[model samples]
Target: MVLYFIGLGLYDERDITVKGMEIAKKCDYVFAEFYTSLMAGTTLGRIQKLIGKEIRVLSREDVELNFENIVLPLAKENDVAFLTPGDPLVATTHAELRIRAKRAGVESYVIHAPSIYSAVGITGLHIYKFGKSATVAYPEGNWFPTSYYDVIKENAERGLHTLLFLDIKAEKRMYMTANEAMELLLKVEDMKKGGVFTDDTLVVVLARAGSLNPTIRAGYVKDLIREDFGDPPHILIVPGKLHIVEAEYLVEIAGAPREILRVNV
Candidate 1:
């Protein structure tokens, strides 16, 4: 008996690797959780039909608080498959689930697939240049969180790019857009006055990754703040120091202005 963690790739059901699909189809029971990130292009039914298995969906609480009682017990007796959007273990809390699986005496393994973390390379920024990643969350009534702003500042100072994961409330059917993330960062600049983000700042937006034709745009904040990247599942990247070739790629491929081609080095 074993628990297999299979990553369903970035945008849809077909993104699952061949090995992952084969492994999933052979599982006695399949469980999936979408709250970490949603597959904007596919539905639950599509995934189940692809694997030819009935899927049981789990919530964050169900997986985090009661995983032992729910998924683990099944794993002890059957070959269970646990599916998640993107790479199975990329989300922070998921590693702990494996630990819990071990505590329950259930063997576990991970099947890798494409993820937004690596997909950012398509934006013309070197994957290694990305530094600290943060999420831009919608402000709540009394608790206004600005930690993501600090993360950008820290990464920028180190001459490293910052990747911003826009917040999502899956149950509420809300997905934060890159434009909204820009607005929130701008507001944080007003409050913190850290000069971390401004109209003159350069930023990149990658929308609907894993789609055949995804949106990739890069420009100063003033030019892109109101620009539509098209659809949900947008990713925001704040580049630090750009290599000459990286800047050239951004200008030529992403339609960034030629002025950005002037590298300081």
Candidate 2:
């Protein structure tokens, strides 16, 4: 029996691939990892209705702390489909689970699907131009990590875009909105004067990508944060040296300000 690590794609239930659907139905049990990302338009009830299957949703603690006790034991007996929003492998925890499964002599398979990385391509930045990705955590007692600033600065020096994944704790029903992420980033920038990101730094905020009517906006970081971006599941992009075409796309598609391009002056 093979353990299938399936990607449910982004946003909706229909976003899953045909092969994934087939495997999902054939599997003895279906488990979904919901902590990493969420299905905004498609609720768990809706997904159950669509697939005609009852999915056991795993909490962050369940996967992180109790994987060996619960999940791995199940995999040993039957073919299990472990579903995750977006691509499964994007989270290192999933990779760790895969290693554990292998050590336990369970065969595993992965089903690839659309990830936030692909959605960022819609911003017109080169895929190869992205630097190390960073996640924004909820501010702890008013203290935020400045490590993200260093990553963005390094990427900026290399002329690469920095993909920022905003924090979401689905189990807590808490999500750090784009505005909050921008605020946190700005706070970090305030302390680190030498960082590439500043209040005036050009930023692209994408909300609900992979969904219909996804919001894309670009401007100075501070100004863009003021603009209301509805709901959760937001991403921030810090572009490096933009190509002419990339600059034009941001202006045309993302509503970037004209002055965003005049950085050298």
Candidate 3:
């Protein structure tokens, strides 16, 4: 008996790799969680249909707190599968579940799929140039989180790019947009005065990534803050000193301003 951790890819149900699909189809039980990220283009019904199994939906609490008690017990005697959006381990705590599986005397295998970590390459930013990443979280009550701002400051100081993941509350169905992220950063800048994010800052917004026509727009915050990036699940990037080729790709492909093409020697 083994547990298969399969990634459902970025956009839809069909994005699952052939190997993942085959293994999932043959599994005796299938469990999934969509809280880490949203599959905006598909539904649980579609994914269940594709896998030919009744998928048991788990919540963040279910997986984080009771995975061993619930899923692991079943996995010990049956071929079980746990599915997640994007790559199973990237940007998720699901990797720790593997340790739990081992302790439970159940073997676990990871089936890789396309994740936003690698999908960010479509933004024309060199993948290696990306440094520390952070999530822009929505402040609630007295807790005003600004660590994401510090991440941008640190990455920009080194001339490296920063990828900011927008916050998502799946139960509340709240998906932070690129525009909201920009506004929040500006608010933080007003208080911290770090100069990390400002009106003149050149930022990139990649919305609905993994979709064929994902919105890719880059410009000064003043110009793009109120811009509609279309749909949920948007990704924000604060690019630092760009290479000439990288700047050109941003301009020609991502609709970045022509001024960004003038890189320093």
Candidate 4:
């Protein structure tokens, strides 16, 4: 009995790699969780039809706390597959799942697929220019996360781009957008007065990354905080010193303002 961690790429069910699909088909059972990220373009039924198998969808709590009791036991006697929205190991939490498998004495293998980490290349930014990544999470109760804001600040100081993964409440079908992320940053700036995020500060937004018509917009936060990029599953980028080529690409391909060519570089 073995366990496979399969990544269903960015947008939809069809984004799953051929290898991942084949492996999932041969598994005794398949389990998936979408709380980590949203696959806005696809549906569970579409995935079922593609795999020709029933998938037991687990919640964030189930996967984080009870994966061993609920899923690993099945792997002890049968081949089981774990499906997630992106490359399983890319998310630090998902990497710990491998540890769980090891502790359970179950051999595990990973099947790679496209992740937003790479899909951000569509933004016409230099991938190597990206620094530490952060996420814009929803503020709830009394806990408001400002570390992500600090991350952007630190990265910008070093002239490195920060990839901000927007928050998602998959169960509630709520996915945070770039506009919301900017607003959150502005609020943080008001409190911390860090001079990191401002309306005039440049930013990039990418939506539905895997789709051919994916929306890629680049401009100042003041303008973009209201502009509609369309749909959920959005990604935000705080670019550092831009290379001229990178600036031109964003201007020509992503509909960024021509001033970005000089202002950001």
Candidate 5:
């Protein structure tokens, strides 16, 4: 018996790779979870139709706590596919699934897909310039995480860019927009007094990436924090010392102001 961890690509059902589709079509059972990220442009019905298999959508607890009890047991008797948005392993606890599969004596394999990790290229920033990536998290009662803010500061010191993933409560259908994320960072700055994120901070926002006409905007936080980026699944980029080409592309393609073209280069 084998278990497959297949990726559904970045934004929609059609973005699944050929082999992922073929493998999924032949699986005895298929499962998916959207806690990590959601495909804003598509739905369960669309994906089920594409693979020709009924999908069992799981909750965060279903996959995290009871995966062995529910998924591995089935995987032990039949071929099973566990699909996830984006590259299955990126920014997720998916690695633990393989360990559980091994303990359960089920073979595990991975099928790749396009991810925001690469889709960031659409902003015209050099991929190699990207440094440590982080996620802006929601602060609950008596708990707050500002590590993501520190990551941006560290990356900026080294002349490297930072990729910040906005938070999402998939079950609640609450997505933290880039504006919300920017606001949170500003709050952290106020608390930590790091001068990391401010109204004048130069930033880039990408919304609904993987869609053909995804929104890409780059400018100072003062303007973008109030602008509508159109729907969920947004990402923020804090670029560091930029190349002339990178600046020009942002100015021409991402609608960044003309000054940034020379300011960052």
Candidate 6:
């Protein structure tokens, strides 16, 4: 029996690669975990119809609570496919599953697919220039996190790009937008007195990355906070030092001002 860890990629059902589709068809049981990311324009029903298979959608609690009970057992008996919205192993929990399955003597395979990491390439920045990636979550009461700002600051000091993933609760259709994320970051910067990310700090916002109408914008953090990026599943890129070509590409592709690039130069 084979346990396939599949990446559904970004956007919709069509994002699944040919290899992933083949495995999906052949698997005795297919389970999808949608907590980390979601299929914005595509529904689970639509995916089920296209793939010609009934998929068991696992809730966040189910995966976290009963991984050994639900996942390992199924893999022991049949060919099981555990699907994630992006790359499955990007989450630590998925890695834990892989270790457990290995210990249990279950054969496992990873079917890689596109993720937001790939979408960052569109910024014309070098992929290796990126540092630790962080997520921006909704603030509770007066509590806000400054850790992400510190990460960005450290990355900036090292001349690396910081990929910021905005938070989302897929099942509730709840998401933290680019504007909101910027506002939260600004607050954190203020609280921590981290002068690295300020009103003038350059930020690039991406929305619906894998979809046809995907949007990319680059500007000051304050200006971005005033702008509206439509829909959920948005991401923010905080670039450190930029190459000449990267600077030019941001102005041409993401609408970053030419003058701003001059300032950095």
Among these predicted structures, which one has the highest TM-score?
A: 3
Candidate 5 has an lDDT of 0.93
* Pairs with steric clashes in candidate 3: none
Which 10-residue window in model 1 sums to the lowest lDDT? 88-97
| Model 2 alpha-carbon miss at residue 234, Å | 0.1
lDDT-best of 3 and 4:
3
Model 3, 131-242: lDDT tens digits are 9999999999999899999999999999999999999999999999999999999999999998889999999998888888999998999999999889988999999899
Question: Could you tell me the lDDT of residue 34 within candidate 1?
Answer: 94
User: Whose TM-score is higher: candidate 1's or candidate 3's?
Assistant: 3
> How do the residues 29-144 of candidate 4 rate in per-residue lDDT, one tens digit apiece?
99998888878889899999999999999998999899999999999999999999977777548888889999999999999999999999989898999999998889999999
Flag regions of model 5 displaced more than 4 Å. none
Clash pairs for candidate 2:
none
165-254 per-residue lDDT for model 2 (tens digits): 888877679888888888887777667778576787889888887888888888887688788988778888888888877888898898
TM-score of every prediction relative to native = 0.98, 0.94, 0.98, 0.97, 0.98, 0.94
Worst 10 residues of 3 by lDDT: 256-265
Model 6 scores a C-alpha lDDT of: 0.83
Best-performing candidate as measured by lDDT: 3
Poorly placed runs, candidate 6 (over 4 Å): 141-143, 263-265
Task: Write model 6 residue lDDT over 1-265, tens digit each, in one string.
Answer: 7799999888988888899998899888989888888668798898888677899988888888787688878888899998888778774367777877888789899998888887788777788989998888776787766678888988988989999888887688788888888888877877788687789988888888788778888888877888878877888889988888888888998899887667455
Candidate 6 residue 225 C-alpha distance from true site, Å: 1.0
TM-score of 6: 0.94
**How much lDDT does candidate 4 score?**
0.91
Query: Which regions in candidate 2 have their CA more than 4 angstroms from the true location?
Result: 260-265
Against the true structure, candidate 1 reaches a TM-score of 0.98
What is residue 203's positional error in candidate 4, in angstroms?
0.6
